[PDB]
Ligand binder design. Structure first.
Ligand code: CLF
Ligand code: CLF
Ligand SMILES: [Ca+2]
Ligand SMILES: [Ca+2]
Ligand SMILES: [Mg+2]
Ligand SMILES: [Mg+2]
Ligand SMILES: [S]
Ligand SMILES: [S]
Lengths: 477, 522, 522, 477
């Protein structure tokens, strides 16, 4: 329906809440107007969640350990505190890497200090120092240690910075203290920022006066691609076919050395703005490295991004750009010819974290689909500013959506597909709505780049058009 | 590149030469990687007895645990009550992880709320979060009961749940009569199974402590059944089926089998089935209470004995032939119902399968892990099968449990080569399966990484994983299985013997090399 | 040599160097073996399209059939009647084979006698063998019924069963009132399923043809169920359970589930359970008769329609979602019983599993074989799952059945790349899985040799077997499984998606090679 | 049990039968007297089975195709007639071989003419000739074809000898017609004899004029070992460690060439007397090759056999014999030290085919076990003559035992272990009596030789002492 019907759907849903929750939630729900460039006129974001309402959000530890640090493959990341957080986050996020796990790479392992009551009462800093020695004995090829604080650490007054300094000096080892306790902030978002500042403070400056590395004019870094199902590799291949040299990937398949080399690049290429804008602005301030936002979802966005990146270099790169575009043209055109007739006109509602709820819209539109509702767990108003121009007039926007709201919106809007996460998937399938995981790619992908678009289209088609959907109603009912 | 009529996902896309060459250039240019000969040397060292001795000297570092934290268990307990919302007072990150962890195992929705305490609550505590959280949860999700547990920041700050819930009622946020049982569930004490015990005893106290003076033991002619932390649907189902077939009146206290298995029929059901409030209020009127997993129900046991005055029987988990027999004989004694022809026949069908399969099972060597009651029942059944449970790991085990398992092992000739490990993790277990190689592992999905490691040393060293336990994330619908009773024993026997025969077929598949033993008939 | 602490059986004993050297010397000295390069060249040729074209031109040679002979099916049918001894008139070698073939699939005793006709009977026929054989069988084994079929020598000599049985009674070898139903079961007609149909129709005629005057259709308010040749215990059990849950009165006609699953309790039970004589005598009083496997019950259908005057419904085997739905809706119409809440919920739980597992099933390609009804139901369910059943082989299939399956394939986009083959064997199927390689085979244990052949070409060409069908000899207790109904579809779905995921784990287990895709969660 | 109690048990059991069956079965049941050398004074054998009594016996086609011809690995054996017989006998017998199945070896395949009604009515000879051409096209490395007749072939008057001669001449191929129709004889036994005469008539004489074989004084053939689970290989290894040269194995792992070379050997070593005495006598007659019976079950028999065989050769082989016996002494002594205390005094009843019912008694006695009853499906009185000195006084002997008899004898005698076949196994296990398959070795073995004894001992112990046997009685009964 129109702005009229969407505003009254909002008001009807909010009738269930007690007054305080109703007043708060009304500020987080909006009907898009793509002419607005100041979203702080139509939606509030990055505030506390209301108690008891079944937010989909995680915590700062998820944003630091889960998202930014955990993918760094040749470091050991300690989940520091009791056993839960490291165990639930073990190998849940598909931040792919090449390595020999347990020997030179450690990503899908769960290292923890497994706090017990005596650690809460008397502190964990002695245990942390002993744990570091045990790591160095049993994992000698590790290239650095991070300490990912869980809730108790700051609450009990432990000093992990002092342990990291003393042990780092004793062992000549990079040991990074990260104060990403889940009591901090309101969501995964502050964990990104905390994590960025810890890279800045303890890793990124190591090679500041070290000019051993041989730079070229075409050196770039991929900033904020966590290589979900290999997404960063299907992006890197195109940048290097265009003649660029990808010195670093932050942090999917990332090594500590490539992070330390990043201040030598000529251009930072930012995919995930939300999680990595902080360190990008730092690098421009300190090293003079420019940064730019790009989008590798679907052919329209990937072609625009390649051209915009190549324009920052010289005619030789712009020429290679057009050769890459010519090479992949028949491939993505075949994907559209097969799949767009199967998906044309279908309507999608999204709910994801900080980037994908706007970034995937172009790829849907390349298959003739319409994103009729979108929202984020933990985005800020600068994300909503970028969303309002990507979404159609009179579409539904939701910040930090409640379980109740999402279900009620879906029952009225009746999308043909939903793209969200694991806590949402099984709800919507029972309602007879095709569902694709848009965090984990439902164990598929990559989705980035030309090669990723083929898999994206295959996946949306296999699910939306599956024979299972015609079978939920028993014929006697 | 892609060919549109055979699209490649990550595997095998990245094996194309262009991707391989790109990854080689990334490594060589930018990763400052240890040379492959050094990686190989360190890998081989991690397989040795010397490495195992250093590994077993750890005091501070845990690697690849085989346990989770208390509130996960409190949530699963709470899910088993009719129209009940699990509610975890404290930090919301914890709830996103508990829900996801169970979502992935059951492939179902998992409903749980937080009251979203933040750093601000360190000054003043989480009282306001409890008030608004209870009111909001009740209004929005219309539960008939909210079962409250805690996250570790609430425990460290010291929030008094009892006082906070009482004040929520006193100040009008929820009606006085609305049930809000609670339990303190510190993640730094015990494990997820401790959380279950704490939540259950809190729910039992809420509905019975203050109303004992009208109770009469045996007056409702039923037996209470407490299942503990249980993640196989077939285990709730088999216990109810066996007691129904015996004509025994019972109440299963915490029963999530409906809410963890709703139909896909075009509607989402937040709640389904579950233990009624009346079942808990009436539970002291039972003949007795049977604990299916006694090694994590010790606080429950003290309350049931101390307050309900039930003479809880000393029964092991009903796994395998002897302990299922013991369970049924004790239920027969308590209820006055004979064991029926149907269960006698099912028992003898299990024994038939044991006779049929004993030659392939005999002497087979296993490493295994899990929660204490599950582990001891698996050990017992393996000894009944003539198998050797040589590495028995229970990360969340205790000394008294170990002594019990050691005594079971000492009583069987099949226990001679077995060791029980408590407080040790899957990085410890990895060393054991290299230094004292068994035939198979029986464990959860985190075992797949150990199998990977063993294969890397060589095919002859590979230890295949048999997935029994929790969580199982990398296979579909195994949560529908059964491990209890004669039905569970039949399922475990079938899985074990066919795992043995699948591996023997792999080892004998080589044309003109090993296929002299590739028999049609086994 | 052996080491007493670790004795080696044939595998891996014969891999010891002394054995390897000995076998090399045997080959080189005395076997005049084709050179390995010639063996490799011929092997490679047998994988080619050129070879497939010669293979498909065969008219006289059969290699690795996927069918057996009539009397095997007559035996299985007879075993489904109370205290009934299967008796095969003719040559005793046949009965040793029938018993052994079922022994190995069910891991159970299989009781059956011969009357041991020899060469001498070619002059005079087997009348005396029938007389002494019926007397001896009745006296020794004390059956309440003897159900008589034939071997091929009795068919070629032309022995008149009806005359011989009538003469046995006339001459006092067995009582006039003792039931001795019979059927001619020539092995050179049809297959084992034709023997089942022939036997059943003979038993039905015996108890009803001459007693029709007092029958009234519908008077007993029940529905007859005829299962056909069925070797999964869970398929007899699921039909009985679903009809009982629905409150439908029924008679299952030929029900061997008890005698193929006796308990091991210290006594041997030659007979157990089965359809009663009273049930067969009363069967014409039913509302109607449903055939679970109509494509091998054509003779029974003609008798039931022509003599009982039942309007047998046009129903497919109850496999998959649509055909289980159709079966229950037609049973509801006949009986007047609504479909209960329990079965509606079970249906929805199957649909849930379909929605949960569809991403890994989608587009997977299968080669499959078995008996016609089983095959067409497996094809139908695979299409429901979004799978492609690309090689459909039914050795004992007919042209009418093929047209029916072709129509099912034509109606689904998932049938576009599928071909149905009748009269073709497992040597034909081996060619198809080389020339047009599918992901998996679904078949009986004889498929393991095709998997072995495909691996020999290379790991990338290997087609793993998923064992569903008959016989299954190389795994234990799969005969307890279910393929019918929602329960069967849930078991099939679970077996298929976990076979996919186990192979993907194998292909992604390579350290630093393919283990970037060795995901914990799938 | 006394002689008088065994006689009473036989009469009690026979009371169930009609008079003709009782009078016949009485002749086939005896109480051993080890002094008798003429078993024709105490038991009848090799007669027709009584109709209706559930004989365990098979047919001549089992004896020819299943037993003698089927194992020959580089020939193609055609099951000629309708589809049953070849399907039930496909890969049921564990006659092990080294080869490339479907390419140079064919043992576990089922080749058939799949008779239909037209073939019965009009004959199968045209179909057989066409089948042979199809085999030659599709299996070009076959080194010969056999035609294994099933019941209908002689009954319909087909002429498979003519087809074999004409096609064999056309293709320069050995094509062997075998008239092993199941209506012939009374059991598997006549199938052995028919098969032996077919080897004599169509294969064995091929090299009669050929002088190119490099003979040695130590050349032997193993006659009548079908290599069940590798039994012939664990025999061959000892003969060759003793200095002999095993030219041929009849027929386990056998090749057509080694059969054709057998007339060139110095000595035929006969294990299975029943199945291969016929061709052994022929070879002595025509080629002057002596033959001798031996026994490789258990250490006592194996040592006695090695010494008796070595005594046929010179001092060099007698010296190597003693070196082989000294090599294996500690190995079998370790097996006896481990397993005999676990089995001493246990009582076994056996029921098998033509050899094993007497031949395995020594091996049981090497573990301290007592064989208290034995019998055969299809043995002749010369086998019973050999049995009566191997069995103890007053033990029970049964020829062509009925299912009823075997159950009732077991119920009274209460053996600790039964050794028999697949049709017997599941009966006795339900009764609570440990059972071992003594045809297929229960998918274990080898049992021949010193290496086989270790596996035999392991297997009898694992089954007799298994924990399952204490669990049949429910504790509430
Ligand atoms: S917000 Fe951890 S799961 Fe919790 S009760 Fe503590 S052990 Fe268990 Fe974030 S950092 Fe972690 S995940 Fe929560 S605790 Fe805080
Ligand atoms: S004694 Fe064959 S199983 Fe029979 S009914 Fe004919 S096809 Fe079937 Fe021996 S040769 Fe064979 S096995 Fe018998 S038939 Fe004769
Ligand atoms: Ca589900
Ligand atoms: Ca059995
Ligand atoms: Mg490829
Ligand atoms: Mg796959
Ligand atoms: S891992
Ligand atoms: S085969």
């Amino acid at each position: 329906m129109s702005r009229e019907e969407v505003e009254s759907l909002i008001q009807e849903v909010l009738e269930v809440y007690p007054e305080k929750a109703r007043k708060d939630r009304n500020k987080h729900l909006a009907v898009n107007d793509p002419a607005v460039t100041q979203s702080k006129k139509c939606i509030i974001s990055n505030k506390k969640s209301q108690p008891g309402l079944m937010t989909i959000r995680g915590c700062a530890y998820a944003g630091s350990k889960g998202v930014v640090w955990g993918p760094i493959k040749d470091m050991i990341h300690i989940s520091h505190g009791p056993v839960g957080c490291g165990q639930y986050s073990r190998a849940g996020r598909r931040n792919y890497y090449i390595g020999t796990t347990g020997v030179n790479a450690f990503v899908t392992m769960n290292f923890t200090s497994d706090f017990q009551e005596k650690d809460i009462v008397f502190g964990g800093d002695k245990k942390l120092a002993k744990l570091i020695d045990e790591v160095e004995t049993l994992f000698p090829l590790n290239k650095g240690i991070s300490v990912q604080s869980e809730c108790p650490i700051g609450l009990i007054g432990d000093d992990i910075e002092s342990v990291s300094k003393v042990k780092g000096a004793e062992l000549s080892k990079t040991i990074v203290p990260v104060r990403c306790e889940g009591f901090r902030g309101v969501s995964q978002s502050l964990g990104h920022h905390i994590a960025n500042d810890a890279v800045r403070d303890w890793v990124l400056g190591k090679r500041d006066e070290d000019t051993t590395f041989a730079s070229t004019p075409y050196d770039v870094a991929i900033i904020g691609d966590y290589n979900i199902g290999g997404d960063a590799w299907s992006s890197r291949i195109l940048l290097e076919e265009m003649g660029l040299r990808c010195v670093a990937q932050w942090s999917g398949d990332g090594s500590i050395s490539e992070i330390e080399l990043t201040p030598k690049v000529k251009l930072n290429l930012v995919h995930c703005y939300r999680s990595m804008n902080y360190i990008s602005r730092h690098m421009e301030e300190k090293y003079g490295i420019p940064w730019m936002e790009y989008n590798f979802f679907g052919p329209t966005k990937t072609i625009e991004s390649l051209r915009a990146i190549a324009a920052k270099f010289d005619e030789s790169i712009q020429k290679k750009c057009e050769e890459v575009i010519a090479k992949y043209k028949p491939e993505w055109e075949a994907v559209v010819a097969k799949y767009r007739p199967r998906l044309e006109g279908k309507r999608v509602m999204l709910y994801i974290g900080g980037l994908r709820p706007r970034h995937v819209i172009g790829a849907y539109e390349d298959l003739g689909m319409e994103v009729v509702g979108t929202g984020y767990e933990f985005a800020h108003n600068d994300d909503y500013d970028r969303t309002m121009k990507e979404m159609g007039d009179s579409t539904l926007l939701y910040d930090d959506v409640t379980g109740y709201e999402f279900e009620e919106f879906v029952k009225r809007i009746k999308p043909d597909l939903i793209g969200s996460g694991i806590k949402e998937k099984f709800i919507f399938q029972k309602m007879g709505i095709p569902f694709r995981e848009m965090h984990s790619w439902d164990y598929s992908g990559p989705y980035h780049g030309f090669d990723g678009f083929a898999i994206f289209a295959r996946d949306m088609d296999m699910t939306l058009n599956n024979p299972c959907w015609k079978k939920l109603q028993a014929p006697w009912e | 590149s892609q060919q549109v009529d055979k699209i490649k996902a990550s595997y095998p896309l990245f094996l194309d030469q262009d991707y391989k060459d790109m990854l080689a250039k990334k490594r060589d240019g930018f990763e400052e990687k240890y040379p492959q000969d050094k990686i190989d040397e360190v890998f081989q060292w991690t397989t040795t007895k010397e490495y195992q001795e250093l590994n077993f000297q750890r005091e501070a570092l845990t690697v690849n645990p085989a346990k989770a934290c208390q509130p996960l268990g409190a949530v699963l307990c709470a899910l088993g009550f009719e129209k009940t919302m699990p509610y975890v007072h404290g930090s919301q990150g914890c709830v996103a992880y508990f829900r996801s962890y169970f979502n992935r195992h059951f492939r179902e929705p998992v409903s749980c709320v937080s009251d979203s305490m933040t750093e601000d609550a360190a000054v003043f505590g989480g009282q306001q979060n409890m008030k608004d959280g209870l009111q909001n949860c009740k209004a929005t999700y219309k539960p008939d009961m909210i079962a409250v547990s805690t996250t570790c920041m609430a425990e460290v700050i010291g929030d008094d749940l009892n006082a906070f819930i009482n004040n929520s009622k006193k100040e009008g946020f929820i009606p006085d009569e609305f049930p809000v049982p609670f339990a303190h569930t510190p993640s730094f004490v015990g494990s997820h199974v401790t959380g279950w015990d704490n939540m259950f005893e809190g729910i039992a106290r809420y509905f019975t402590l203050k109303s004992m003076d009208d109770k009469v033991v045996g007056s409702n002619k039923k037996i209470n059944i407490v299942p503990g932390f249980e993640t196989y649907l077939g285990n709730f189902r088999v216990i109810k089926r066996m007691l129904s077939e015996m004509g025994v009146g019972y109440s299963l206290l915490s029963d999530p089998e409906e809410v963890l298995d709703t139909p896909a029929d075009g509607q989402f059901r937040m709640y389904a089935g579950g233990t009624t409030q009346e079942e808990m209020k009436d539970a002291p009127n039972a003949l007795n209470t049977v604990l299916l997993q006694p090694w994590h129900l010790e606080k429950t046991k003290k309350f049931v004995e101390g307050t309900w005055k039930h003479e809880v029987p000393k029964l092991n988990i009903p796994m395998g032939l002897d302990w299922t027999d013991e369970f049924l004989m004790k239920v027969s004694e308590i209820s006055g119902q004979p064991i029926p022809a149907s269960l006698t026949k099912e028992r003898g069908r299990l024994v038939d399968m044991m006779t049929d399969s004993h030659t392939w099972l005999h002497g087979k060597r296993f490493a295994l892990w899990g929660d204490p009651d599950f582990v001891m029942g698996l050990v017992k059944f393996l000894l009944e099968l003539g198998c050797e449970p040589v590495h028995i790991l229970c990360h969340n085990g205790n000394k008294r449990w170990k002594k019990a398992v050691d005594a079971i092992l000492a009583a069987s000739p099949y226990g001679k080569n077995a060791t029980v490990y408590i407080g040790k993790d899957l990085w410890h277990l990895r060393s054991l399966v290299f230094t004292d190689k068994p035939d198979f592992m029986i464990g959860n999905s985190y075992g797949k990484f150990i199998q990977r490691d063993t294969l890397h040393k060589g095919k002859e060293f590979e230890v295949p994983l048999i997935r029994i336990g929790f969580p199982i994330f990398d296979r579909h619908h195994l949560h529908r299985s059964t491990t209890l009773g004669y039905e569970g024993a039949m399922q475990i026997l079938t899985t074990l013997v066919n795992s043995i025969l699948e591996r023997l077929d792999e080892e004998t598949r080589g044309m003109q090399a090993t296929d002299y033993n590739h028999d049609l008939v086994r």
